[PDB]
């Protein structure tokens, strides 16, 4: 198993395995979106760019496997300029919806905007915005807040197994919404409400009802099934608000059913 240097210290990392996984092994955490373990790697959303100890240009952290005593300066300034570089692009069109978007309490995009993104705006034109695509009793698609981490399709084709939804179009105007009005019902349709990076897809039944910093987050297990998956029930004081899966290797692993949700 190859030796590899996280910024300074040596680490006897497992053979191959992505640079991302290396720094994950040292515990330092690279900024991320499209990547997700228990899903699949993809090259879009290059927010994970990191600088090689010597090679002039940065490479996606979840792409290249580590090898041969590499050193990698996560905190290197060029890396930081890269990340600001990307973040300004992501924020170049995501609509000013923070107060109303139901994802507002903990959307990963916010925190990534805080930790890394340059604070001044310097876009000065017109955001694109797009019509909604109705999808079922559950999920409240809004799009526009969409950032094309394809993620959800990689969820559908690779776990729900349904491939009804998918990407469409090229350049801007490309949309992760499924073409054709047809409703997408599936038994793992609920978990995407968890998986969706932003507020582009959030649960209608729970919508508007509460805000994340509020609710207490009890840990327990499901009863709708004897499968016994671990969960984080969330209550806004004396009353249950919303359920979320709690990851556990033997059972649910970060997922949950849907009838239970």
């Amino acid at each position: 198993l190859i030796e590899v240097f996280v910024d300074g210290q040596s680490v006897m990392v497992e053979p191959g395995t992505t640079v991302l996984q290396a720094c994950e092994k040292v515990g330092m955490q690279i900024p991320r979106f499209c990547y997700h373990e228990r899903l699949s790697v993809a090259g879009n959303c290059r927010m994970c760019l990191v600088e090689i100890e010597k090679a002039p240009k940065v490479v996606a952290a979840c792409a290249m496997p580590v090898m041969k005593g590499w050193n990698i300066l996560t905190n290197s300034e060029k890396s930081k300029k890269a990340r600001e570089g990307v973040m300004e692009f992501l924020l170049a069109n995501h609509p000013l919806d923070c107060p109303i978007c139901d994802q507002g309490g903990e959307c990963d995009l916010q925190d990534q905007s805080m930790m890394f993104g340059s604070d001044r705006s310097r876009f000065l034109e017109g955001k694109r915005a797009v019509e909604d695509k109705n999808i079922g009793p559950l999920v409240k698609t809004i799009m526009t807040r969409c950032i094309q981490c394809t993620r959800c399709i990689r969820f559908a084709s690779e776990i729900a197994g349904v491939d009804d939804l998918g990407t469409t179009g090229r350049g801007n105007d490309m949309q992760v919404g499924t073409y054709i009005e047809k409703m997408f019902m599936s038994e793992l349709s609920g978990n995407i409400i968890d998986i969706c990076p932003v507020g582009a897809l959030t649960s209608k039944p729970y919508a508007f009802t509460a805000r994340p910093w509020e609710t207490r987050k009890t840990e327990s297990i499901d009863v709708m099934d004897a499968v016994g998956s671990n969960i984080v029930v969330s209550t806004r004081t004396g009353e249950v608000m919303r359920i979320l899966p709690r990851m556990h290797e033997d059972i649910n692993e970060e997922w949950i059913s849907d009838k239970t949700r």
């Binding site: 923070c98 107060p99 805000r211 509020e214």
Partner: protein
């Protein structure tokens, strides 16, 4: 001016008040627009710091110019949503005047 209410239950007025006087419980409009069901506040705990005045993105709640409303009974202090709206009705030209005279400094 349309006559529609401004508040949209981003609920961070609850989230920034140090006395936490505010309590909010939003539920969806039949139209599907976000709205409060029981916005409420209690002057018994409010410290008139004006953080709410700063916090609102849609500039809904406003710390009004009126300064006198001393009252007989404690239960009256604990304003309901409807009460706040009525205060917003009573003073609106006045408040809009202050904000008109002030916002540039914000």
């Amino acid at each position: 001016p349309s006559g529609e209410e401004r508040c949209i239950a981003c609920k961070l007025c609850e989230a920034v008040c140090p006395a936490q006087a505010i309590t909010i419980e939003a539920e969806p409009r039949a139209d599907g627009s976000r709205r409060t069901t029981r916005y409420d506040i209690d002057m018994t705990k409010c410290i008139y710091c004006g953080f709410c005045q700063e916090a609102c993105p849609v500039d809904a709640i406003v710390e009004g110019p009126n300064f006198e409303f001393s009252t007989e009974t404690h239960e009256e202090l604990l304003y309901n949503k409807e009460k706040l709206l009525n205060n917003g009705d009573k003073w609106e030209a006045e408040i809009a005047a202050n904000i008109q005279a002030d916002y540039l400094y914000r």
